[PDB]
Amino acid sequence: AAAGNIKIVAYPDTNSLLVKGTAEQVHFIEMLVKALDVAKRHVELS
Amino acid sequence: GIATAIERLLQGEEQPLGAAAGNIKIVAYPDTNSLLVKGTAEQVHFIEMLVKALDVAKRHVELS
Amino acid sequence: YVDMVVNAATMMDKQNLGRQKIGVMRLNNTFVGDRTYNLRDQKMVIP
């Protein structure tokens, strides 16, 4: 369909996203999320 | 809670969910801690499979 | 033979709606939702 009928709702109770769309748009957001989800490093400032 | 997150997910939503995705009504019933879903026989089974994935037991953290 | 090749060539091109689907994606290394802090009078919100 279109890019304007995708609904994204935060569910903080299990720390997860809820995406509603077609079977090709759900796989499209799942590949974007795994690129924005990386582990961070610690900085100590003195 | 869980009854406000799924209610905003199905808001508007003129989409062919299997009628439409916009005529599903979800109402919280706190007196027995359960959801009330009204739709066709295929949309009710569609929300029942989503609820069993968001319903997991939690672990305890003690912070000192 | 020509009428078979033409008619069976234009009928493999036409050969070769979408249901909705809800996906749940758990995040392991970040937080959903905004973070808020203060600098002595004013509130800052990070998306």
UniProtKB/Swiss-Prot annotation, chain A:
Coiled coil region boundaries: none
Domain of life from the UniProt record: Bacteria
Annotated knockout phenotype: Insertion mutants are hypoinvasive in the HEp-2 cell assay.
Subcellular location: Cell outer membrane
Assembly information from the UniProt record: The core secretion machinery of the T3SS is composed of approximately 20 different proteins, including cytoplasmic components, a base, an export apparatus and a needle. This subunit is part of the base, which anchors the injectisome in the bacterial cell envelope. Forms a stable homooligomeric complex. The complex is composed of 15 subunits.
Protein function: Component of the type III secretion system (T3SS), also called injectisome, which is used to inject bacterial effector proteins into eukaryotic host cells. Forms a ring-shaped multimeric structure with an apparent central pore in the outer membrane.
Stated family: Belongs to the bacterial secretin family. T3SS SctC subfamily.
Protein name per Swiss-Prot or TrEMBL: SPI-1 type 3 secretion system secretin
Gene: sctC1
Curated annotation (Swiss-Prot), chain C:
Knockout-associated phenotype: Insertion mutants are hypoinvasive in the HEp-2 cell assay.
Location(s), subcellular: Cell outer membrane
Domain of life: Bacteria
UniProt record similarity statement: Belongs to the bacterial secretin family. T3SS SctC subfamily.
Described function: Component of the type III secretion system (T3SS), also called injectisome, which is used to inject bacterial effector proteins into eukaryotic host cells. Forms a ring-shaped multimeric structure with an apparent central pore in the outer membrane.
Known partners and oligomeric status: The core secretion machinery of the T3SS is composed of approximately 20 different proteins, including cytoplasmic components, a base, an export apparatus and a needle. This subunit is part of the base, which anchors the injectisome in the bacterial cell envelope. Forms a stable homooligomeric complex. The complex is composed of 15 subunits.
Protein name: SPI-1 type 3 secretion system secretin
Protein's organism: Salmonella typhimurium (strain LT2 / SGSC1412 / ATCC 700720)
